[PDB]
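Internal ticket - ligand job 608, 2-acetamido-2-deoxy-beta-D-glucopyranose:
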Amino acid sequence: PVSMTKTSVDCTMYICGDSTECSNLLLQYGSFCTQLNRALTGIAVEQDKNTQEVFAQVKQIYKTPPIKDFGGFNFSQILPDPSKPSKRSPIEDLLFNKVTFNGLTVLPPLLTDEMIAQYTSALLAGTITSGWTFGAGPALQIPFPMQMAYRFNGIGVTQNVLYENQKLIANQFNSAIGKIQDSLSSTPSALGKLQDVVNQNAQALNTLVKQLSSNFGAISSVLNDILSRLDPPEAEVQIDRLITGRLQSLQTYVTQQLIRAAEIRASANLAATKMSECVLGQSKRVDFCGKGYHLMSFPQSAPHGVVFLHVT
Amino acid sequence: LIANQFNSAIGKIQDSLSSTPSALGKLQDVVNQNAQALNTLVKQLSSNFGAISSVLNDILSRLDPPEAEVQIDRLITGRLQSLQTYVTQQLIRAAEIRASANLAATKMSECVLGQSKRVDFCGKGYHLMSFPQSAPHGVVFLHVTYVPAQEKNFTTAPAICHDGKAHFPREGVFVSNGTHWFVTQRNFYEPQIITTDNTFVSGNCDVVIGIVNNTVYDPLQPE
Amino acid sequence: NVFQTRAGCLIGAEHVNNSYECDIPIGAGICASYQQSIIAYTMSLGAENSVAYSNNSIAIPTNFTISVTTEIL
Ligand SMILES: *[C@@H]1O[C@H](CO)[C@@H](O[C@@H]2O[C@H](CO)[C@@H](O)[C@H](O)[C@H]2NC(C)=O)[C@H](O)[C@H]1NC(C)=O
Ligand SMILES: *[C@@H]1O[C@H](CO)[C@@H](O[C@@H]2O[C@H](CO)[C@@H](O)[C@H](O)[C@H]2NC(C)=O)[C@H](O)[C@H]1NC(C)=O
Ligand SMILES: *[C@@H]1O[C@H](CO)[C@@H](O[C@@H]2O[C@H](CO)[C@@H](O)[C@H](O)[C@H]2NC(C)=O)[C@H](O)[C@H]1NC(C)=O
Ligand SMILES: *[C@@H]1O[C@H](CO)[C@@H](O[C@@H]2O[C@H](CO)[C@@H](O)[C@H](O)[C@H]2NC(C)=O)[C@H](O)[C@H]1NC(C)=O
Ligand SMILES: *[C@@H]1O[C@H](CO)[C@@H](O)[C@H](O)[C@H]1NC(C)=O
Ligand SMILES: *[C@@H]1O[C@H](CO)[C@@H](O)[C@H](O)[C@H]1NC(C)=O
Ligand SMILES: *[C@@H]1O[C@H](CO)[C@@H](O)[C@H](O)[C@H]1NC(C)=O
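stdout (C-alpha cells):
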C-alpha cells in the first residue's frame, strides 16, 4: 500500500449540523475544531506526498520502440495496451478489477490513475531499453540480452551462461509472467493488503457516522428535536451533552486516522526504497527484492498501491 | 579535472544554500509544528468550557467551595482533555522524528563511514562518498556522486568469433567505431585492442546469437 | 473565468491548454499557477523522451561530472 483515501470532516457541521445555538455552545470549547481540521488536512497532503515519492522518481517519460523485439523476451503482459481505453497493461487491469452527507468529504487524489499509469510505463520503458543507467544519469541504450548478461554477471554467473541458453531463459521468463496473471485471477485473496486499508478506512467512517445516533445521556439524538421541544434555558444542557459525545467521537476518529496514516507512510517509504533499488538497479540485499538472487523488477500500478514483479 | 569539478560543486552547493531560503524547510516545519502545538495548548487556558469564568482565581474569590466545585470541575475536565490531546500529538510526532533519526543514522553509517551500492540511497548517481554537516535539530549530508555524461553511439556484439571459438569480454564490452572492434569498460569509453588477456573462451560460434567475425590479438605470437 | 474540475468548481482561474509543472495542487491532475493572472491546467509528468533502442546498439559515456547534492534530515 502507498496511500489511503483522503477524507475531510467538517467539525462544525458534524457536531452541530446547521444549528447556530449549537455553534455558539461549541465556541465555548476553544479551538478543538481547528485542530481536528488541521490534522485531517495534514494527512490528506501526506497522501499526495506518498504517491509522488513512490512513482515520480524519473524526470523524462520514456517510450518503448514500436518494433518490440528484445531477443525473445515478451513484455506484452506488463507494457501498456493501446487497445483498451485505459492505457493499462493487462496485469494492471486485473489489479484494478480485483479491488472492490454529514460534513464528510473525499478529496480526489492529486495524481489521477492515468498519470500513475504513465509513470509506471515510463519506468518500464526505461528499464527495458536502458537497464539501470537511466536511474543514475542519461539513459544509455543497450540490447536487452546484453543487459541481462550484465545482471547475470552481477550474481556471480558468467555472462556466457546467458547467451548459450538465451532462447531457454526467455521462454522461462515468458512462462513465469503468464503464471502471475493466472494466479491473481484465480485467487480473490491475492490483493488482501490493499483491501485491508480500504476496509479499515471505510469501517472507521461508518462508525463515525453511526455515532451521530447516540443519545449520550440527552433526551434525543436529533438536535432539531431538542430545539423544537425545549426553549434555550434547559435545551442548552441537552445540547451540551450531545456536543461532548460527538466531540469525543470525532477526536477518537482523528487519533485513529493519525496512527493509521503513520503506518501507511511507513509502507510508502518502504515502497519508494524498493522502487529505487529493486527497479532502478540490481540489489544484492537478500530477500529485499524477492526470494533468490535478484535480477530485475517491474513496477505495476494498483489502486492505492504498487505491485512489484521480482524476476530472480 | 576531478578536483576542479569537486571544488566547483562544493562552491555551487554553498551558493545554492545561501541564495535559497526554503532549502531547509524540513527543520522549519518541525519547529513550526512544535511551536504551534504549544501555542494552541496555552490558548486552551482561556476557554470557559461551560464555567462562569476561565480564571480559577475569580471563581475562588467569588464563590464558596460548595458551588465553585462545579465550575472548577468543568475547567479541570476541559484542561485535562486539552493536555491529553497535546500529549498524544507529541507522542505521534516524536515517533515520526525517531523514524527520521533512525533513517539519518543509517545514512550516516552507510554513506559516510563507507561506500554504498544502494541506488538513490546516498544521492542521485553512482555514490562516491558523503560529508556530514551539523544543522539545528538536524543533519545535512553532502553526497558526492559520479554522473556519466557525453555518451556516444556504438555497435556492439555479444561475443567475437575467432578460430572457431567464441570470446566474451572479461570485464568490459565489445564496441565498434564503424570498421574496427575494441573492448572497453561499461562506464567509460576507453577502447582497447581485443586480446586474449581481456577476453575468455567458451564454446564455438554456433550457439551465441549475434556473434561477429573479428581477429583476437595474441600477445605470444610476436615472440 | 469559470472552470469545472473533478475536484469541484474553480472560479477566477483561466484554464490554460499548455502543460507545466505543478505549482499549487488543485486535484485530479489539475494544478494552478500565477503567470498576469491565475491559470489552471493539467500537470505535466515530464519531458517526452524516446531513447533509440536497437538490438546491436549501445551508448557509452565518454566523460563525466562530479555532482554534490544536499539531503536534510
Ligand atoms: C507476446 O506474448 C503475448 C501473450 O499474450 C502474445 O499475444 C498472443 O498471441 C497469440 C498467438 O500466439 C494470440 O492468439 C493472442 O490473442 C495474443 N494475445 C494478445 C493479448 O495479444 C504475443 O504474440 C507475444 N509476442 C510474440 C512476438 O511472440
Ligand atoms: C576506428 O578506429 C580505427 C582504429 O583507431 C581508426 O583507424 C585509424 O585511423 C587513423 C586516422 O585515419 C589512422 O591514422 C590510424 O592509423 C588508423 N589505425 C589503424 C589501426 O588502422 C579508424 O579511422 C576509426 N574509424 C572511424 C570512422 O572513426
Ligand atoms: C564468419 O566467418 C565464418 C568463417 O570463419 C563464416 O562461416 C562460413 O560461412 C560460409 C557461408 O555460409 C560457409 O560456406 C563456410 O563453410 C563457413 N565457414 C566456417 C569455417 O564455418 C561466417 O559466415 C562469417 N559470418 C558472416 C556474418 O559473414
Ligand atoms: C569533460 O567535461 C568537462 C566539463 O565538466 C570538460 O572540461 C572543459 O574542457 C574544455 C575544453 O578544453 C574547457 O574549455 C573547459 O574550461 C573545461 N571545463 C572545466 C570545468 O574544466 C572536459 O574537457 C570534458 N572532457 C572531455 C574529454 O570532453
Ligand atoms: C544514436 O543513433 C540514433 C539513431 O536513431 C539517434 O537518434 C541517437 O540520438 C544517437 N545517439 C547519440 C547519443 O547521438
Ligand atoms: C537484429 O535485428 C535484425 C533485423 O532488424 C536481424 O537481422 C539481426 O540478426 C538482429 N541481431 C541480433 C544480434 O539479434
Ligand atoms: C485546447 O485545445 C482544444 C482542442 O482539443 C481547443 O478546443 C481549446 O479551445 C483549447 N484551449 C485553449 C485554452 O487554447
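Auto-summary: The first helix of chain B runs from residue 2 to 19. Chain B touches chain C through 51 residues (CB under 8 Å).
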